[PDB]
Amino acid sequence: VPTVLQKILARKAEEVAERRARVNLAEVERLARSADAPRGFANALLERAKRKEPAVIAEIKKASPSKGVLREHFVPAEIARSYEAGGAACLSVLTDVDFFQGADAYLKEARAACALPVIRKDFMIDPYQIVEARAIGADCILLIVSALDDVLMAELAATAKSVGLDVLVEVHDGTELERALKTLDTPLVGINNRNLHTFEVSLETTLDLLPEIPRDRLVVTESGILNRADVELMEVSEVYAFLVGEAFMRADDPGLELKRLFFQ
Ligand SMILES: O=C(O)c1ccccc1NC[C@@H](O)[C@H](O)[C@H](O)COP(=O)(O)O
């Protein structure tokens, strides 16, 4: 529905077709069976959150639709190592090329550089992309409720499980939340505080949904985390899992900014 999302998804269908033409599904499936074992993306968040410790998914993002270029000097392996040293639980690596100035290679490089699990941050609309995520070494994929009907969403999640990927489902409102909870049993329920129609950010997007989130799910609050008051708000509300990019991409030492926001 969101205009920018429609444009991304239209492009995404083209890119999938183009890649499938060059590398067909059977080959991507062979590469996925051969990849390094998944590192346990959900487990890494769950083991910290259950101890009331910050579970930070640190995001490697060169540019974005809402902000333009976020980091001039962009070396994924170095960002990954800084993130790990600063206390991140997992990484998020944008692999979308035309809207986030990302690349699949950035995920391979970030993952090889550290021992943390990595979510492929991209726009999944086709089982091909899910199998491909595992072939490039991802430990988790992203499903965006705004972008999917329920049957397709269940199908993509089932494809992910069958290649050993964890699933992060992202919602923006109560209607999307209830579709996600009814359709998927992943524990990882991501709430995006950034409205994709206006690009406005509200941390209360997360807080207002907590009364509908079962205790067997883990809330991952996404976007808008910029300062320590934001972190305090979430932790007092018993939100311990975060997806954060801009706050770190604007800093000289991204891992140090992570330590300053979460571990002092
Ligand atoms: O950030 C954007 O401009 C944007 C635009 C269109 C679609 C999705 C978008 N962002 C996806 C969102 O998951 C963010 O990359 C992460 O939540 C990290 O947010 P940040 O901490 O950088 O505000």
Author numbering: 3 to 266
Paper text:
The next step is the formation of the indole moiety, which is catalyzed by indole-3-glycerol phosphate synthase (IGPS; the product of trpC). This reaction comprises a ring closure of the substrate 1-(o-carboxyphenylamino)-1-deoxyribulose-5-phosphate (CdRP) into the product indole-3-glycerol phosphate (IGP). The IGPS structure has a canonical (βα)8-barrel fold with an additional N-terminal helical extension comprising two α-helices, α0 and α00, of which α0 forms a lid over the active site. In this work, we have probed the structure and mechanism of IGPS from P. aeruginosa, because it has the highest reported turnover number of all IGPS enzymes characterized to date.
The PaIGPS–rCdRP complex crystallized in space group P21212 in a large unit cell containing eight enzyme molecules per asymmetric unit. The substrate analog, rCdRP, is bound in the active site of the seven more ordered chains. rCdRP is enclosed in the active site by the helix α0 and βα-loops 1, 2, and 6. The suggested catalytic residues (Lys123, Glu172, Lys63, and Glu61) adopt similar conformations and identical interactions with the ligand rCdRP as in the SsIGPS structure. In chain B, the same conformation of rCdRP does not fit the electron density, and the ligand instead adopts a conformation where the C2' hydroxyl is shifted 2.2 Å toward the general acid Lys123. The observed movements in the C1'–C2' region in some chains are possibly coupled to the position of the guanidinium group of Arg196 on loop 6, which adopts an “inward” conformation and interacts with both the ligand's carboxylate and phosphate group in chains B, F, G, and H. Chain G lacks density for rCdRP in the active site. The helix adopts an open conformation in chain G, where—through domain swapping—it covers the active site of a symmetry-related molecule. Moreover, the disorder of these three regions reflect their innate flexibility in the apo state and suggest an induced fit mechanism of substrate binding. However, in PaIGPS, there is a phenylalanine on active-site βα-loop 6 (Phe201), 4 Å away from the anthranilate of rCdRP, whereas in EcIGPS the corresponding residue is a leucine. PaIGPS has the highest reported turnover, and from structure-guided mutagenesis we find that an active-site phenylalanine is responsible for its high activity compared with other IGPS enzymes, possibly by guiding the rate-limiting condensation step.
